[PDB]
Amino acid sequence: QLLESGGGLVQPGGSLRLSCAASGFTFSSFGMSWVRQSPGKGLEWVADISHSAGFLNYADSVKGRFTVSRDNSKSTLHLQMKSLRAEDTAVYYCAKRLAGLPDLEWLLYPNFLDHWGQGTLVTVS
Amino acid sequence: IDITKLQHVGVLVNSPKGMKISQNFETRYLILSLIPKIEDSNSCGDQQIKQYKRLLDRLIIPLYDGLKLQKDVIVTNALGVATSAQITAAVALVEAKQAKSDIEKLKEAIRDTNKAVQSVCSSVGNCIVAIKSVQDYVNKEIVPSIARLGCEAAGLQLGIALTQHYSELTNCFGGIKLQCIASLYRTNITEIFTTSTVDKYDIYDLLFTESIKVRVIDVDLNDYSITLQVRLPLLTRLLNTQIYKVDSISYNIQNREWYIPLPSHIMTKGAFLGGADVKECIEAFSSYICPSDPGFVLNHEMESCLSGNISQCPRTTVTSDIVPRYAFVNGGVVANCITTTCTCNGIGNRINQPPDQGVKIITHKECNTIGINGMLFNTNKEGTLAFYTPDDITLNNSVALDPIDISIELNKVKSDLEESKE
Amino acid sequence: IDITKLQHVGVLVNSPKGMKISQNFETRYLILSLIPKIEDSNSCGDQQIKQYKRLLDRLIIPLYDGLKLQKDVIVTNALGVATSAQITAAVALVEAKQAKSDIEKLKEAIRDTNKAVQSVCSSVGNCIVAIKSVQDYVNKEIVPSIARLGCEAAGLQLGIALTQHYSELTNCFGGIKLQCIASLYRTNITEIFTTSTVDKYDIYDLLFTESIKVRVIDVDLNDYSITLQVRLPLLTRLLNTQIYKVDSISYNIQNREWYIPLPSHIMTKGAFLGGADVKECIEAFSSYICPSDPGFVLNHEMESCLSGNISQCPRTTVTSDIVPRYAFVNGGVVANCITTTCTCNGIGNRINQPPDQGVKIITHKECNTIGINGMLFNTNKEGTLAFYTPDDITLNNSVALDPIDISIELNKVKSDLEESKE
Amino acid sequence: IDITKLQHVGVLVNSPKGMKISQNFETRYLILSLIPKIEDSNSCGDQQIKQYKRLLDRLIIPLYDGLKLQKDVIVTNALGVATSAQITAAVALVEAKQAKSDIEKLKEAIRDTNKAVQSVCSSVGNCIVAIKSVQDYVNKEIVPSIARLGCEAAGLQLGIALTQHYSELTNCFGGIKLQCIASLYRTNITEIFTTSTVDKYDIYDLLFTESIKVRVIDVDLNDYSITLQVRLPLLTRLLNTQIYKVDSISYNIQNREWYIPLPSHIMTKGAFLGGADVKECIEAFSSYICPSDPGFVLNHEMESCLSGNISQCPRTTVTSDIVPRYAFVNGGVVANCITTTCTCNGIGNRINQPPDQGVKIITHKECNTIGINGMLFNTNKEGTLAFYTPDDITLNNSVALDPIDISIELNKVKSDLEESKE
Amino acid sequence: ELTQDPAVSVALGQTVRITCQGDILRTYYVSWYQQKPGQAPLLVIYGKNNRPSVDRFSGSTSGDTASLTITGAQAEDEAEYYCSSRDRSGNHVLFGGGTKLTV
Ligand SMILES: *[C@@H]1O[C@H](CO)[C@@H](O)[C@H](O)[C@H]1NC(C)=O
Ligand SMILES: *[C@@H]1O[C@H](CO)[C@@H](O)[C@H](O)[C@H]1NC(C)=O
Ligand SMILES: *[C@@H]1O[C@H](CO)[C@@H](O)[C@H](O)[C@H]1NC(C)=O
Ligand SMILES: *[C@@H]1O[C@H](CO)[C@@H](O)[C@H](O)[C@H]1NC(C)=O
Ligand SMILES: *[C@@H]1O[C@H](CO)[C@@H](O)[C@H](O)[C@H]1NC(C)=O
Ligand SMILES: *[C@@H]1O[C@H](CO)[C@@H](O)[C@H](O)[C@H]1NC(C)=O
Ligand SMILES: *[C@@H]1O[C@H](CO)[C@@H](O)[C@H](O)[C@H]1NC(C)=O
Ligand SMILES: *[C@@H]1O[C@H](CO)[C@@H](O)[C@H](O)[C@H]1NC(C)=O
Ligand SMILES: *[C@@H]1O[C@H](CO)[C@@H](O)[C@H](O)[C@H]1NC(C)=O
C-alpha cells in the first residue's frame, strides 16, 4: 500500500493543508493517523482519525490547533495547518493503522501503525 | 457437625459437599446492537421491523436518564443518601466512563460489520465483545434469499425473524439475568466470555455465571444499541467449607408428632458452625457455588444441638404432613414406627415401638426385609452402630413458629406475673 | 361450628362446601416424541428441525442422569438419606422397569407411525400413549404443499411452524404441570387419556387434574423421546368434611379497630373442628378438591373461638385497609357503624352505634332501605337477625402478628420481672 | 421526623417526596373484540384463527359469567356472603347496568367496518372505546394480498400473528393489568379514552394508571368480545404528606454488628408518623402515587424513635450482609469503621472508632479525601455536620426477628417466674 | 512518557537486546519501530505477534518493561528503535527516544 501526496512551504503564523492518498488501500475500511518527526529528535504524536469521521483525536502540542479531515469519497486524508510557531518545523508521515473492518481485533490499539508514507517537509522560519 | 447421635433425634444430616465463592469479579462489557446488517440491496421490511424496536429502547433512554441518583460526582479519587448496595453498583459503573471512550470506539465499527460475535479488546485480559441482533440467522436467510428473489418474499423471512426476536425481547427488558441474553442468540457463555482463568469451566460453574445480575449502563438511540457491564466471576475453592443439607422427621413424644426445625443447610467452617441460606447458590456435584458467603449464625441452641448435646434442640409441633415420618438413613431405614407401620421382616409382624422413643433405627440386618406401611426392601449396612440405642433423650426446648401462640403464651405469662407479685 | 352468634364479633363464616381427596393415584405413561414426520419425500425444512432441537435434548439427559441419584438402590419386593417424600416419588420411578417392554415396543412402532396420538394397552391401567407433536399439522401442511411447496410454501412453512413450536417447547420444558403437557399440543386431558378414568370427572374437576405434577423418567438421544409417568387421580368424596370460608370484620373496642385473625378456610371433620388450606386445592361448584388432606390443627384458644365459646377469640389490631369493616350477611347488613356511615331509610337518617358494642346487625327489614357510607340498599326478606347476647363480648386474647411487637413486649415482661426478685 | 441526630444510629432518611392518592375514580368501558375484520375471501381461508379463541374465551364464560355470587339482587336504591371488597366490586357491576344499553349499541357497530379503534360517548363522564384485536396489523397486510401477489404467506402471516397474539392473550388471561391491554395491542394509553382526565398525566403518573386492575363484566361468545370496565383515577395531590425512604447502617456495639430495623418507607401527615408501603405504589420524580393510603401506624417505640427520642429504637443483631455498613449520607461518608477500612487523604491513614461509639461521622471539614476498604473519594461539600458530640447513646431495645428465638427466650422467662415464689 | 536506552552498539554478529520501561506497558502491548535514517519507520512487533516481512527477532514483554531481542548483524540494523504504546486512557500514542544501533 502506498500513501503520500506531499507539498508544503510556509512562514511562521501561516497556514497549510497536508494531504495523502492511500492508493491500492481500503481507505474507508481502515483508520488513519499522522506522526511528526523533528529533524533533530525522534517521532511524536499529533492526530488520529477513525475509519469514519465519527471520532477525531488530537494531541497537537497536547492541544487543539490543527484539524485533520477524512474523506472516504476520494480516499484522501487531509490535515489543516494554521498558526505555526517554533514547534512544528519537522517532517510528516501519513500513516495507516493496521486494524480495520475485516480484522477488528486490533482496532482498540491506535499505535499499531502498519505502513508509513514518505516524509513530507514543513518549515518554521 | 455430628451426624451420629443425631439420627436418633430426627435430624438427618446429608451429603457433605464443598463450597466455592465468587469473591472477586473480572468485568467485561457486552455491547448489543439490536439491528442486523443486510449485505444486498435493501430489505423493504427493515423500516417496519425497525419501527417495532423503536417502542422498546425509546422507553430505556429515559429509563436511565432521570433514574441515576448521581451518587458519585466524585470520581474514585448533592449526593443526599445512598448505600453500599449502590456504592459497589455505581463505582463499578464509574469504571464505565474510563472505558466509555473505548467502548464508543468499537460502537463506531460494529455498526458496519456483518459478523455475529466479535471479541475485540485492548488490555491483556479484559475484552469487550460485540453481539449483533439476529446476524446469526441473517447469514442463514440472506443465503437462501438468492433463491427467493426479493427484498420481500424473502425479507418476509427476515420480517418474521426480527418480530420473533422482538417477541423474544421486551421479556427480560419489560437486573436482567445473564440467561436471557444468551437465550436470544441461542449461544452460551463458555463460547464468548471465557479467557485465561475465566475460561476453564465446569458444568455447574456455567449456570452460576448465567445466574449473576447483569447491569445496563448506556443506550444510544441512533445506533439502537445497549451497553451491558457483566461481572464474570473467579471461583476459588474456599477451604474447610463443608455444606451439609439437613432434613427432619417426626420424632414422636407420647403419641404426638414433633420435629426438630433445622434450616435448609448447615456449614462447618473451622469453628464456624452456623447454617446457610442457599436459595441463591447453584448446587454442584460435590460443592456449592455461592456469590457471597451466605453463612448466618444460628442460635446457641441450634448450634449446640448440632455439635451433639441433643438435650438442647428446638422441638416444634408438627402441623400438616410436610415433615416425613420415615427416611432411608444409609443402607438401613429410620422411621417413626409408632405413627407409621414398619413390621420388620414379616409383613404382618408389626413391630412395637416403646412410647418413650421417637424413631426406631432398623439396620444391622435385623430386618433383612423391611416394609414401610407396605412395600419391601433390604437393608445393607452402616445405618447404625450395632443397633445404637442412646440414653433417654429428653428434649426441653419446645418452640412454636406462629406469632399467635407466642403472643397468647406470654399473655398468660403476663397475666400470672401480675398475680405473682402478690 | 355455630355460624350464628359468631357474627356478633366479626368471625363471619361463609357458605359450606364439599371436600374431595385423591387417595389412590393410578398411573399412566406418556411418550413425547419431540419430532414430526414427513409423509413421502425428504423436504428442505427437515434439515433444520433437528438442529434447533440440539439445545433442549442435551440439557436434559445429563441433568436427568445426574438427577436420579439412586434413593432405593435396594430393590422393591450407600444411600445417605432420602425422605418419605423422595422415596414415595422414587418407587414410582421403579414402575418404569416393568413397562419398558411396551415402552420400547410402542416406541419402535412410533419410529415411523403417521399418527398424532397412538394408544396400545396391555392393561387399560398403566397403559401407554404416544404423541407426535405437530405431525397433525404436518398432515395439514402436506395437503396444499403437495402441489406448490417449492421449498418455500412447505420448508419455510414447516420451519416457522416448528420454530414457533420450539419456542413454546423450551418454555414448559425448562417437575412439570399437566397444563403445559396438554396445552403445548393443543389437546385437552380428556382426549389424551381416553379411558374410564377421565370421562368420570366433573367439568370443575378435570381442571384440577391438569394442575397435577408430572415426572420424567426416560430420555433418549436417538428419537428424542421423553417418557412421562403421570399419576392420574381417583377422587373420593370422603365424608363429614366440609370447607367453610371465613372472613373477619372490624370489631370496634372503644373507638379502636380490632379484628379476629382467622385463617382463610376452616374444615370440620367429625371431631376435627378446624384449620384448613386451599392454596393447593381447587374448588368446584359445591366441593373443594385437594391432593392431600390440608387440614391442620389450630390453637386451642383459636379453635375454641369457632366452637361456640366466643370470649376466647384472638383479638388483633387493624393496621389499615386489610379489614372490610362492613359486609353483607345473608339477607342483611353487618358493619362497624362507628367507623363507616350506616344510614337507615334515607341518607340523612344515620344509624347510631353504642360505642361499647362491636358491629351492629341490621336485618329482618329493621331498615327496609340501608345505606352503606351513603349508598342505599334494600334489606332482603329471608335474612336472619340475632340481637341476643348484647352482653359485651369482652375478648381478652389480644395478639399481635408482628414479631417486633412481641419482642418489645417481653422486654417489658423481663424488665419488670428482674427487680421483682428483690 | 428529624434527619439530624438520627444519623447517629445508622438511620439514613432519604429525600422527602410528595404523596398523591387516587382519591376519585373515573370510569370507562373497554369493549375488546378478539376477531379481526377482512375485506373478503375469508382472508384466504383464515377462519382457523377463529378456533384459537374458542380454547380461551369459551372457558371464560363459565369462569366469570357462568358463576358469580350475585351479591347485589337487593335493590341498589339468599345473597350469600361477601365482604366490603366484593361489595365495592359488586357496586361497580351495577353501574354497568345503566350503561349496558350503550354497550350493545357500539357492539352493534364494531362488528362491521375495519377501523382499529372506534369511540362513541353518551355522557360527559362515561365514553366507550372499541378495540379490534390485531386490526391495525391487518390494515397493513391486506395490501400484501395483491402487492405480494398471494393470499398465502399473508394469511399465513396473519395466522402466526394471531397465534402470537393468542399467546399474548393467554399470558395474563391464563387480576388483569392494563399494561396487558396496552402491550397485547402494543398501544398508548394516552391514545385511549382521549379524556381531559388522562391527558394531564406525567410519565410517572401515566405509568401508575397502567397498573390498576381491569375488570371483566361481559363476554359475548357469538362475537368473541370481552367488555372490560376499565377504571381511570384522578390523581389529587394529598397535601401535608411527606414520604421518606429509610435505610439502616450497622451501628456496631462491642464489635458486634447490630442495626435499627425500620420499614422500607416512612410517612408524616401532620402528626400521623406511621410507616408506609410502596409495593403497590409508583415512584415519581418528586412525589408518590398510590391507589390507596398505605400509611399504617408503627409501634410507639418505632414512632418515638423517629421523633428525635433516639434512645428508644429497636436494636436487632445482623445476620449476613444485608446492611450496607457504609453509606453516602449527604456529602460526608458515615460508616462502621471497625468493619470497613476508613481512611483520610491516603490509604495509610486509617480511622479508628472508640470501643464505645458506633458509626462515625466524616465531613469535608474533617476529611477532605476518603477511601473505604479500598477505593478513594474526595468529600464534596454538603449539609452533614460534624460528630456533634452526642452523649453515650445507650439503646435499651434488643429485638429478635426469629420466632424461634422469641420462643426460646420466653421459655427461660417462664422458667424464672415458676420458681420466683417458692 | 515511556523511555529507553539512548543508544547501543555491538560487533558484526552475536545478538542484541533493546530495553524499554515507563509508566505504561504494564497492561498494554508494545509496538517497536525501526526507521533507517532518512526513511519512513517500519513495524516489527505488534502485540506479541510478528510482521511476516521481518523469523529473525520477536522481542519479549515483561511485567513492567519491554524488551526486543535480535540476533546477528548484517547490512540491516544500523538504525535506532522506537518503543511505542497505546495511551493510558486510549486516546493518544506515546513514543520514546530512538536507541541508535550500529553493527
Ligand atoms: C457451548 O456452545 C458451543 C457451540 O458449539 C458448544 O460447542 C459447547 O459444547 C457449549 N458448551 C457448553 C458448556 O454447553
Ligand atoms: C453440649 O455440648 C455442647 C458443645 O458445644 C456444649 O456447648 C453444651 O454446653 C453441652 N451441653 C450443655 C447444655 O451444657
Ligand atoms: C429437660 O427436662 C428433663 C425432665 O423433663 C430434665 O431432667 C432435664 O434436666 C431438662 N434439661 C435441661 C437442660 O434442663
Ligand atoms: C377436548 O377437545 C375436543 C376437541 O378436540 C372436544 O370435542 C372435547 O369436548 C374437549 N373436552 C374437554 C373436556 O374440553
Ligand atoms: C368456654 O365456655 C365453656 C362454657 O361456657 C366453658 O365451660 C369453658 O371453660 C370455656 N373455655 C375454656 C377454655 O375454659
Ligand atoms: C376478660 O377481661 C375482663 C376485663 O377486661 C374481665 O372482666 C373478664 O372477666 C375477662 N374474661 C375472661 C374470660 O378472661
Ligand atoms: C404513546 O402515545 C404516542 C402515540 O400517539 C407516543 O408518541 C407516545 O410516546 C406514547 N406515550 C408516551 C407517554 O410517550
Ligand atoms: C424520651 O426522652 C426523655 C428525655 O429525653 C426520656 O426520659 C424518655 O425515656 C424518652 N422516651 C420516652 C418514651 O419518653
Ligand atoms: C438503657 O440501658 C442502660 C444500661 O444498660 C441504662 O443505664 C439506661 O438507663 C437504659 N435506658 C433506659 C431508658 O432505661
Numbering used by the authors:
A (entry chain H): 3 to 52, 52A, 53 to 82, 82A, 82B, 82C, 83 to 100, 100A, ...
B (entry chain B), C (entry chain C), D (entry chain A): 20 to 96, 119 to 215, 225 to 472
E (entry chain L): 3 to 9, 11 to 52, 55 to 95, 95A, 95B, 96 to 106
Q: Could you give the paper's own sentences about this structure?
A:
We obtained a structure of 1 Fab in complex with HPIV3 resolved to 3.62 Å. 3 × 1 binds domain III of HPIV3 preF, protruding perpendicularly and binding only one protomer, with no additional contacts to other regions. Only four of the six CDRs are involved in binding, with CDRH1 and CRDL2 being too short to contact the glycoprotein surface. 3 × 1 binds site X with a total buried surface area (BSA) of ~812 Å2, of which the VH contributes ~612 Å2 and the VL contributes ~200 Å2. The 3 × 1 VH and VL together specifically bind the cleft between the HRA helix and a sheet-turn-sheet motif, a short contiguous region of HPIV3. This region is crucial for the preF to postF rearrangement, with both the HRA helix and sheet-turn-sheet motif displaying >9 Å of movement during rearrangement. The CDRH2 and CDRH3 of 3 × 1 form several protrusions into grooves on the surface of HPIV3 preF using non-polar residues. His52AHC and Phe56HC (CDRH2) along with Leu100BHC and Leu100FHC (CDRH3) account for ~55% of the total VH BSA. The VL residues of 3 × 1 form contacts with HPIV3 preF using polar functional groups and the CDR loop backbone, with CDRL1 encompassing a large protrusion on HPIV3 preF. This CDRL1 extension is supported by Arg91LC, which contacts Tyr31LC and Leu100FHC, with Arg91LC forming a bond with Asp143 of HPIV3 preF, which is conserved in HPIV1.
